[PDB]
Amino acid sequence: DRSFRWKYHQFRFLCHSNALPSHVKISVSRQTLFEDSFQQIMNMKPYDLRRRLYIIMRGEEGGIAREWFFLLSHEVLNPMYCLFEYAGKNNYCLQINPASSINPDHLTYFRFIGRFIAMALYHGKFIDTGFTLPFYKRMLNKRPTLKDLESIDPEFYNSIVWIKENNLEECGLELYFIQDMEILGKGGESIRVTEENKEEYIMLLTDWRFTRGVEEQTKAFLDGFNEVAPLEWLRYFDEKELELMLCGMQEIDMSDWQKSTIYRHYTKNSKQIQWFWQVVKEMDNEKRIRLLQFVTGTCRLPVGGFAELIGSNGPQKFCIDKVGKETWLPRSHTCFNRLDLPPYKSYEQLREKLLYAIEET
């Protein structure tokens, strides 16, 4: 497929080609901002949202749309509503809340957020909600993979990766094709698990973890998003690019990044890292973000730059270490912000290998 720049352009014209006359009024007070928006947009028909956007606060003027999109994207994350939760510590790994059914109209709210996210894309405006790549995969009809579990849920990854090797007979646990779900207070048989059908079991579990409890809500969100902007229009994008379009690119500070990097079996004076920073310098900004996405799981820096960078287990700085065979592609552990970089024999190989890994893996 083509360069992102080309894909964005092709997406833009598809939006513009399908744009429609006149405009839409959505007026909201800053206290009532979430409720207002809700009622207004749900009472509007999805198509009408592709018209020109006129937003009024009741009070003053000013610019106003970018705020509205920004404020409302933060306001939906308020745990007060039980729509979205964080799997990890300190706002790590945003996801739909299984206990969202606590409010009986929750699906209409997810449908509302759907439309809202589609408006942001369709009208060229950015949000800072903080969805994770697997959320974006599902918007692109991509099955989340085994490595995406590591991004959201490290302990569950380790127990699956352990299950993958070695009989398991040297074990005392049956591991039936069933899973318990503790929510708000709570073909399909126990089955036999075998060396053969571990590979079936693992898939079903990998699928299950991402989908568990958030099935009608995710459907609600997409039928959401679709009513306004068809998902077909996204088909050529990958998840990292989708995130990019919704969050926006920003200037990476190469100094901040290099000062705030730690090491395992390596040093700044070591030759792999000298080459590493040489290729990162050699990159344009679109590739630097791609690298950051590859290593951290996102294209957005935390407030305070590379020093304040968080993983799954609290504060976790960007780190490279001598792991993997040479003649291997470097691989990330996004939950720890770690990059396994093999001790490649020359700069040339490493440079070649790093670029492909960032772009293809």
Query: Determination method here?
Result: X-ray
Residue 104 neighbours by CB under 8 Å, 6+ apart:
none
Q: Is 335 a residue of the active site?
A: yes
Query: Which DSSP letter does residue 39 get?
Result: H
Q: Nominal resolution in Å?
A: 2.8
Phi, then psi, of 218 in degrees rounded to 5: -60, -45
Phi, then psi, of 125 in degrees rounded to 5: -105, 145
The string of DSSP letters for 285-297 reads: HHHHHHHHHHHHS
CA–chain centroid gap for 247, Å, is 11
**Alpha helices, H only, the chain:** 4-17, 33-42, 64-75, 106-122, 133-139, 146-152, 154-164, 198-211, 216-228, 239-247, 254-259, 271-282, 285-296, 347-360
Angle (nearest 5°) at CA 247 between 352 and 281 = 30
For residue 262, the cross-strand partners are: 319
Active-site residue (options: 93, 247, 319, 335): 335
Residue 205 neighbours by CB under 8 Å, 6+ apart:
160, 179
Q: How far apart are CA 307 and CA 253, in angstroms?
A: 12
